[PDB]
């Protein structure tokens, strides 16, 4: 039901004017460094619960990702009013609270406000202990690209709306999508990343050009080292994908320096939902990447290397 | 352009439920944090085109957002700007006038723009997350009230009849200019104001329009209120639109919403307009009976305008005369 009821990357505006100041999303006050986010996204699923529950890991992610504890938040949610009932908002809430808390992070309100197709998300305010904040332009050539969570949701969650596939048919994406990236914070931090960003709407290689444009380098991915789920591959290969994912795929085009088959650029510009962190490390590092996630009981996959040539490199 | 692309067709959840907090949570589910003795509020709001004007719907929109910290007896300090529209139907560009407009209205609020969302939507919708801080450590909630205690309101109600009217095509810009700068200004004045008097208890008047929000205060503060539709103030073309069947049905909504503490015979126009969702409303405040013998005179030195609308009282029912 939930499904039935659902129908770029540019932020220069900003850069191009005079902002007062007394991606970025960080504020100093106190000796104290604040980071805040928000995201509200369309149902990825019928189950009202995982709905919301997902969600809310998907917007306390980018905390995370900035090497952040969130702290509090609040809850945004849209619907139409005559198609959608208190009950089945009553089981968003339900699975949004129980993330939080895992997450130790406070709903303090929320604001409910019309919209023609449902969504819900969180605007959530966290610190950066120690001032330590890891941004997207810290990093350099020659440094290791970490992913810690596959790619392929928004293939899935395709499948799923066109009925070719079931809930019960995606429970490791349903998992991956429900698990906060505190633990995925935790060893970007360990392993002293130098820049760092979640994988969320723009896919994969959108989220890496923002390391590159950012950090004025570019990056090699090898598409055989990255973790997707193998439903995906089989969806994208019968043309079976969102929208998003070629219009993502269009917004890289003119950095991307590849010859692989379409349906590969295809999958690896998905847009992911509640993505893993995506996160540079000095190659010295790999002498104790393996025991740190082991340690913090994460995964992760070495999916390549940032470049000098300023292009996104697919191979 | 923007008028014609919207369509013409949450406490209590909460409170049933067991809500993770911790120490520094002085909540009762608005939005009021501490952390290291600093108390901070939070709000958000979004909105769909309130004028065909992107640069003044982008201000009208912050105005609207920012209210609520100022209600809270905050002062805004950061925000996140949160955009939504179909690419379809709307251009990437005319966003940049929003933002203009959104990034000035900032700046008159001293409060800063720490970077942005954009949504696809179906309609279009621009509004902000705001965090604020309480100067003092001190706060207001619509909990505070006793009987006995004055209503006052700080900017008139009408708003979204005259919107409506826009809409229609029965109104221009040009034929409500004193309501757009109502909604331009912001409420750091009013909050002077209501903070001076010691008010009791504070909520802004918005989309549940005027009826609504005073409810806010009458069931939180466990009393009821008594509201002289003479008292207060509204545009006179809202009247005139109001009367001519001509509003929005979000006002026959929020009407419906107050049918069970509502206790009034006034006519269904009156109502109709008390209803009215309103944009960037003022701030509705309590105040005790002796603080009215200095309200005009704090009002007139912060420069903001004041309306006795009525009192609070035990009877619990919102009481329209």
Redesign the interface.
Known sequence: ELLKLV??D??E??KG?N?????????E??G?I?V??????TPVVNDPYLWGAISTANALSDVYAMGGIP??A????CFNN?ELD?EI??EV??GA?DK??EA??????????D???P?FGL?V?G?CPEGKYITQSGAQVGQLLILTKPIGTGILIKGLKEGILKEEDINEAIENMLALNDKARNLMLSLDATACTDVTGFGLLGHAWNICKNSNIGARIFFEKVPYYQLSENLVKKKIYPKGAIENLNFVKNYLKSNLDNWKLILLSDPVTSGGLLFTINKEKLEKIDETAKELEVNYWIIGETIAENVLEVL
């Open positions: 129908r770029g540019l932020q505006i900003l004017f902002i007062y100041t007394d991606d970025a999303g960080v504020y006050h106190n104290i604040w805040y986010t928000v995201d509200i996204i702290v509090n609040l809850a945004i949610s005559c208190i908002f009553r809430i339900r609270l939080l808390r130790k992070t406070v709903l303090l309100g929320g604001h409910t406000i919209d023609k197709e969504k605007s305010a610190i």
